[PDB]
Amino acid sequence: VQLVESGPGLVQPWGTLSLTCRVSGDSVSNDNYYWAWIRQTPGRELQVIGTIYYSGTTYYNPSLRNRVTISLDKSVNVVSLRLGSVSAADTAQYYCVRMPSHGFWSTSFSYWYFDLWGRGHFVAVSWASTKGPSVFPLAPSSKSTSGGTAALGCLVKDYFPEPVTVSWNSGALTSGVHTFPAVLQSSGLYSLSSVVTVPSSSLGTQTYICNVDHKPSNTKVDKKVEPKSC
Amino acid sequence: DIQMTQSPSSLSASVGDKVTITCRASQSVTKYLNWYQFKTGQAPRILIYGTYTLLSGVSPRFSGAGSGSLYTLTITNIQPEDFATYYCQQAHSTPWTFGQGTHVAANRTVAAPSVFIFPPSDEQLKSGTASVVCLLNNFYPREAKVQWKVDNALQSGNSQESVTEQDSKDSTYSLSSTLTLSKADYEKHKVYACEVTHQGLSSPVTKSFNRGG
């Protein structure tokens, strides 16, 4: 059973924001399960936006009830969430969730718990428009070397909205990688760095490419990082 | 809405220790109390429902207890895969509500950071600004002081800091201090230096270069 959420990265204020969750294990009309939408705001607070059932019945959190709708699309096995009149305070990670419906004679009747969660999908709500990042190499030198290992990276600067995804050598290099959280610059754009430590002996034989992705602006960038020889 | 509060908000523990997390509610929730595990990298994961019941595939180190308005999650022999943030949720009332979360991090032996410095990329000088990066790799504890010095003068708000989350296996942190400047100012001065103070260093560690060579 797999739960893949998807939707837009950035939504304009006063717009309506729609997300879809593809359920890859069993049918949403299984009627042993309810399905639900739960969101986490920046600041770690967990809010349960809504609950839905194969029969059509929905529950909506009162503070949102005036402007939210959940529905099932049985033919493709997806569950949809629409949230209208959206403001800055709706910027959040949106999780799709499954909830056992225990029947009257079940040992665990009236016990309501969220037993399976999707990976989430982040949605920023802002008047500001999308803007892709610039990628600059952080080349190794004698000054970014400590002992037998050298450090290198690439700076992903000036982008909006979050997030950016960074990989090294197309996923084959995943040992000692540190891609930092973003920081909000004065300009109102985001920037981070991604750095890896490798054995210094491996420069001049192994190529190191960093692969940046920014789906809100359809940005893909491959930057090659060459040793400097200080 | 039933308000939920966990204690402590954050804690840290050595591998093997017993860890108890307390969840108090504004009303009585009559044992309709669920516990969830949140780790970066994976999808959120339930571990307990209805105070006591473990779900399949959850290790029996986790155990739930409580009644009335007061419940408690217990990690018996805490393991590397258990370091995470835990949430309690009430199913008693119509709008389901979570706690604020308890972050459980690792205790570890002191580890000094390796310090690296990066001057700005030629491409970026072409763009018209200049960022210089100081990297502090694989250290513990989290507290570290990073000062920038340009020709021996200390900087203001020119730089920003960022800190990774604790490494799953290393149990250590890394930190980037990026100092951003106009190309003008960067071309003005010569000697750019990054000074680091941290426990498990005896003397402050400085990394510096001369602009150009």
Binding site: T51, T57, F104, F109, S110 | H92, S93, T94
Partner: peptide, 19 residues
């Protein structure tokens, strides 16, 4: 809504199980 109803239904069910 139905959720809150199950809260009481549990006690109803207990009343039944006793007999």
């Amino acid at each position: 809504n139905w959720f809150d109803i199950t809260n009481w239904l549990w006690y109803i069910k207990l009343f039944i199980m006793i007999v």
